[PDB]
Amino acid sequence: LGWLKAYQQKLASAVGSLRNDSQLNTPKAILIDLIRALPVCLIILAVGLILLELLWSFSKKLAIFWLVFGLCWKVSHWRRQIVRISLALLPIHFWSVVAELVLGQAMIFFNLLLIAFLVWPMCRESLVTITVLSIIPIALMVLTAYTTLRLAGRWIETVYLVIIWNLLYQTVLRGLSVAARRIAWRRALAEQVNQQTLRITMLLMFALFGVMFWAIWSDLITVFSYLDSITLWHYNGTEAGAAVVKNVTMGSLLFAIIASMVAWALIRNLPGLLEVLVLSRLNMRQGASYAITTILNYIIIAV
Amino acid sequence: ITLWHYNGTEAGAAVVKNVTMGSLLFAIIASMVAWALIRNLPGLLEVLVLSRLNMRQGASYAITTILNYIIIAVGAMTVFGSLGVSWDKLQWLAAALSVGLSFGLQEIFGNFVSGLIILFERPVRIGDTVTIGSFSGTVSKIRIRATTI
């Protein structure tokens, strides 16, 4: 911990250096924060495994929650709110662990009401995702009075996901700022360009967040099944050498629409990303840059 | 109605499918709709595209004729399929005509490939003096299709 604190202090001292700006500074800060939070998680794991499968569930849940808490700590009023949320979220983990394997229902309802009251000031201050998440706990508390436990588990997993997504938001914003400063210095030596790369990163992060959301929310597949069972028209395709009538569905139609929109967005936001990546790293002639841009455009639209 | 039948393909099996008065009326309706859309094309295009965004008259005419061509082609294809259904019969003629009539794009694709090769190899740069075909001058802009001197 002493060496970790010394490294963190050195990184804080060397913050926003013009001659030492790099995209690795944010990853180093994230690693330092993770290392700082690691001792508390290790202590929690040791406490859980001191007497040792009921206890494994609480040990794992507490370790994960404390790791998230340490990540938030190492990265004012928000700190106090995060500290206070521990008592509100403690009984949820116990209920989830119990359900994995009279007064309890009242305690759960009181905890949900307290969580809603705590989140109400945040909703008043606040965009739509936070309000939707806050409203979901109220509906879960109303419907609780077994599946509500799984709904609450999905909700807290989604909360962890959006927290991680916002952390990555800040990280990519810092990286984009560093890259923009570097390209500005290079241009001086020799915001639409940065905006195109920002949009590409936004699309990539939205895709990753949606993939994670589908990974956690694997229970509600009825909508996907309905979209994949439209059966509009069929064509005689080949399957293992056999002529089988495969029918296209609304899922296939939506997939085609999404692919076309993604291709159009990639085509429109191509030159900014190419100039940020290839031109900045290695200088090249304008003619060669134009030729490679048009080659990429052609192959992308063709595919 | 079951007027006449043709040996079509269903799940890899040769099945005699018979056209009906319903198919004939569908073909007639499709042809009439295609004709009406062709006749009432430029007004709709000027109301929608021209009003929202200003464009050159030449570009508007080109897009109008492109839309007309694709619409009449798709209408003829639908009419032929809904009455004859012989795509698997005239696909060979389509391919032969396709090559015989797409040997018209050689002069364009050669231009594009030559432009790409010139851009990659850089035999001439912007600012020098070039003479070709008794046309001496300073090259100003270089593109993938044509070069300006």
Swiss-Prot record, chain A:
Residues 1-37, 268-293 are cytoplasmic. The chain crosses the membrane at residues 38-52, 53-73, 87-101, 102-122, 127-145, 159-179, 204-224, 247-267. Disulfide bonds: none annotated. Residues 146-158, 225-246 are periplasmic. It is found in: Cell inner membrane. Mechanosensitive channel that opens in response to membrane tension and specific ionic conditions. Requires high concentrations of external K(+), NH(4)(+), Rb(+) or Cs(+) to gate. May participate in the regulation of osmotic pressure changes within the cell, although it does not appear to have a major role in osmolarity regulation. Forms an ion channel of 1.0 nanosiemens conductance. The channel can remain active for between 30 seconds and over 3 minutes; it does not desensitize upon extended pressure. Its activity is masked in wild-type cells by the MscS channel. Belongs to the MscS (TC 1.A.23) family. This is Mechanosensitive channel MscK. It comes from Escherichia coli (strain K12). The lineage of its organism: Bacteria, Pseudomonadati, Pseudomonadota, Gammaproteobacteria, Enterobacterales. The gene is mscK.
